[PDB]
């Protein structure tokens, strides 16, 4: 419409109904000019870290993280009362757009409105561009609604061939100006809608049974087993006798079972105490990248973090592995710290019921055939892939964690649940790209065929609103005794948690999982 | 609509009809940026003065005071002609909104219009936020229609636990961006309507009878009483005789009565003459807070001011108590004065008919059982709560006084009439919040996930209009002789009262109650 | 329920202390009374209470 | 809290007697009636609509 | 009980001679008499409590 | 404050141990407990106050 | 039973009634070794908060 | 229920189940009980051995 009419309103809510919750988030954004209106190819040849790609002039909106859409109170209502969650529909608006001229004259900068400038926006619905939004990276909305955020710069990668960055004929370039975009002046606004595909509910419960205890404790099995090959308590001694017995109540380690625990790949275990670790450098041939479990893709090492879902240490335990996601509090300065008290540790220990431990093993296998002259021998199974009859539990979603990931486009995949948590989606929520339209500066009055390198310095601000419809399963359980609940236990504090501080800073001092309520196997 | 079209008009009126008066007030406001767009938690640990809470970036409109809605002539028409008053409906408009850029270059500031900036507005109709508007505080509209006022900054408190400010798990934080707001550019306007719940009329009359004189002076009672236990005029002397008599006309202190005066809690009495007071310091262990009647809430002292409704001294009397509200004239400088001539004293003395005096007592009680060997003894009743059969009169409303208060949300309450005067309301007129939308400054051209700390300096101005429908009860009394009226008695003046002065200042030099007309019990 | 104590008198003259009808010691003083604008009023009957 | 229901950022327009004397001590100093506006930060002195 | 007792402080009690109404009280009105008044006019006032 | 101070009379305060309800009070009821009673019968009486 | 759901706009998390009991030889709120059912805590109803 | 480590002690995640907390039919000698069920679609078991 006009320059003096607002093209949208501020909406932040959570609306709760039966089997349904709708969240709406509104933020203020600022968009700079990226790469001085240029596409730049980027890439470094650095062993395993070798990459190549392009940084675009464009930018994109990332809401992918849960604390974007929920207050800490709403996250509490969700995880205390409900067994399951999943997204249903989505709507995004971009409005109240303001383009700013910035001028420097005497050495000090002034800002004015440019009323005739445009900003370009398009959503990629058909996924024709590389999808970077699921990578677990910064640029998501700030969790606190009053904070203003910079729109992140868009860029992508391409095939790395070996450890060298040089491109081959299979590398692709993508110009985003080669897409239809809407162009918006201050009166214009943008809107797009999306439908989530049907996906299994996330499990917001922990199991109240163990996979190996699923039996009736009062009863014997009708199955029989070999109890011993000899009399007495000692190995390689006594009389050789095959002793069979009915499998009685009270020895439940010997019970025949229908199901097996899930897959495992062992992780290296580290201590939060510096004195209990061996001394492993960050770089060199002995670098810690070497001694963590890694995968090799085309000759390059990649840390297997988090990896397949596995039980891990408690968040307050001394030991930890790469199977645990780590978040930071405010206290660190400069992206490095020597103290674990400044970090937020994630624990999967809830799934220790159905899942093998991350740092222990799947089990121990008998690797020979014993006989009268051959003693039995066992080896550890450190990594055991999936076998018929296994059941397992996924990693938990976190309030600081990602909501979804895009299932890679491949003909094979197995159990397409993202390993950092959340909802695997063949077609995920689309990326919405935004750039400032270049405004040339004062040109030469004689013609040149050279491209224009000279531009007015500009940036834009505006409002973005995301609405997500969530489907929730309420807990119907018949458990008699009270559940674990997520509560505020923090006690007496100089400054409230989950609130702004003395100086106006909003920090998240805890990591909150979704698993409080329980369910039986 | 547009930038060149006004979105509202100036309306200031009082419209008088039968049983009805409608007031309309229009003011010009200015809204700054508060806390540099931040939420700040605030709190000091100071014994009884310990508090905690948050100051918001937002602001809110307060019309709660009577001189906002009435001219001194309209207040006169009301209180001379009418026995009763109460609000009925309300409508608020906010319009003609102007956002200003302010720039500093050479050391001197310039102001320009920013046509694309917005201001955010919402009314909290469902009372989900702490209601601060009834607290008897500054930020109400100026009584004089030509004056421009700053919009007050919004903030709230929370539970104080003991005398320490530290928060517990019961303290709540409130983000106002977590509410749906309308966003307004210069062409946009805002409107909201409200209905008052049914409330008893305020009594604009004083009683022309005394609670203890309600009898017929010409007649005896048929009741009998014990006149004396002895002959003669002296205590503990004479012959012991039980003497009974009919209760005759002319002794009206002995008459049996159906009703009792209201409740009392004694106040300390102070003199406006410095030499007639004992010397009581402002601070220390002997501080005046100690020797005023106070209440203890969770260990903290609070002055009981005004307290329950009680008769008090005349506004021109030497003595005064905390039961009297005090207003200031212009003369004081620096929020302190040693002279009472600069203040406006409020008097409740009209209610001395039905109410016990604030500084005297409810009465005197017989605290023993006398007998031949035991002399009778009496004690003062300083504080007597309500007993069946009491009747009382509320504190009066003042032209400088608050119109309403929000009845606290609690399961018990008794006679929910605000103690500073006015209309107790379960659902009061809503708070209407307003803030300037942050406009980021020139950002960095490389991405950072840090929040934006850099902002264009802005403020907004505009117009606000409040319309209240009032219901009034006209006086029908059969009194033969003339009433007391509120009049201009001021005599010959160098400068008119209730008018601007030589230099253009508008001051209120008197405090005007509502009680002039009389009514019989 | 609520209470405000009353002075108790005997119908037997010898069991009462000697209280005159008038004066500064007058019986109006030693009965429970209320003060309204400085005046004493006997609190008779007063709030409902069990009695003899 | 019932006694904190106010806005912590704002003063009342009400005035009160702060002290009857100069100095920090009882029964000492010069006898002076000192009045002041009731400022933000002393919330024990605020006039209130409700009682516990 | 008007104090707080402790190992060094003996407990002390005072009489409640006049106690106003508190939440949870129940009471009975005075009786009507054959020689007594039938009605009274409730005073015209904005407050009153249990207008019997 | 149980007296009236003056130049020759120091101020004096007493404790209010029992204070009945006065106009303008607000209060909160006792909480219900999982081991606690659900209801009570309001006594049959002509007066009662806040029958919780 | 009729229940009112909490609609509050509080940003930060509430206090909740939870099982905090930790590691136990015998579960609380469950029968014991010998078949006895005991209640080892007293549970009020007040966890959630509301502003005045 | 969940075994935590090699120790039997329960944690807060252990659940108790009272079966009297379910609706039951009660039967005297003349009464009888009946219930029906539908299997979900499942692959046939293979009752053959492979000849290749």
Residue numbers in the entry:
A (entry chain B), B (entry chain A): 222 to 742
C (entry chain G): 483 to 534
D (entry chain I): 431 to 482
E (entry chain G), F (entry chain I): 587 to 638
G (entry chain I): 691 to 742
H (entry chain J): 379 to 430
Paper text:
Adeno-associated viruses (AAV) are single-stranded DNA packaging viruses of the Parvoviridae and belong to the genus Dependoparvovirus. The virions of the AAVs are composed of non-enveloped capsids with T = 1 icosahedral symmetry and diameters of ≈260 Å. They are assembled from 60 viral proteins (VPs): VP1 (≈82 kDa), VP2 (≈73 kDa), and VP3 (≈61 kDa) in an approximate 1:1:10 ratio. In this study, the structures of the AAV7, AAV11, AAV12, and AAV13 capsids were determined by cryo-EM in an effort to complete the panel of available structures for the defined AAV serotypes.
For AAV11 and AAV12, the closest related AAV serotype is AAV4 based on VP1 or VP3 amino acid sequence ranging from 78 to 81% aa sequence identity. In contrast, major structural variabilities (vs. AAV2) were seen in VR-I, VR-III, VR-IV, VR-V, VR-VI, VR-VII, and VR-IX for AAV11 and AAV12. Most notably is the 5 aa insertion in VR-V for both AAV11 and AAV12, relative to AAV2, but also to AAV7 and AAV13. In addition, both AAV serotypes possess a single aa insertion in VR-IV and display a different conformation to the other AAV serotypes with the apex of the loop positioned over part of VR-V. This subloop of VR-V and the alternative conformation of VR-IV are responsible for the broader appearance of the 3-fold protrusions of the AAV11 and AAV12 capsids. For AAV12, HSPG and sialic acids were excluded as a receptor, and no binding to the available glycans on an array was shown. An interesting difference between AAV4, AAV11, and AAV12 for AAV vector production is the requirement for the assembly activating protein (AAP) for capsid assembly. While AAV12 is dependent on the presence of AAP, AAV4 and AAV11 are not. While the VP structures of empty and full capsids were largely identical, some alternative side-chain orientations, e.g., histidine 230 (AAV7 numbering), were observed. In the AAV serotype structures determined in this study, the histidine side chain preferred the “left” orientation in full capsids. In contrast, both orientations are equally adopted in empty capsids, except for AAV12, where the right orientation appears to be favored.
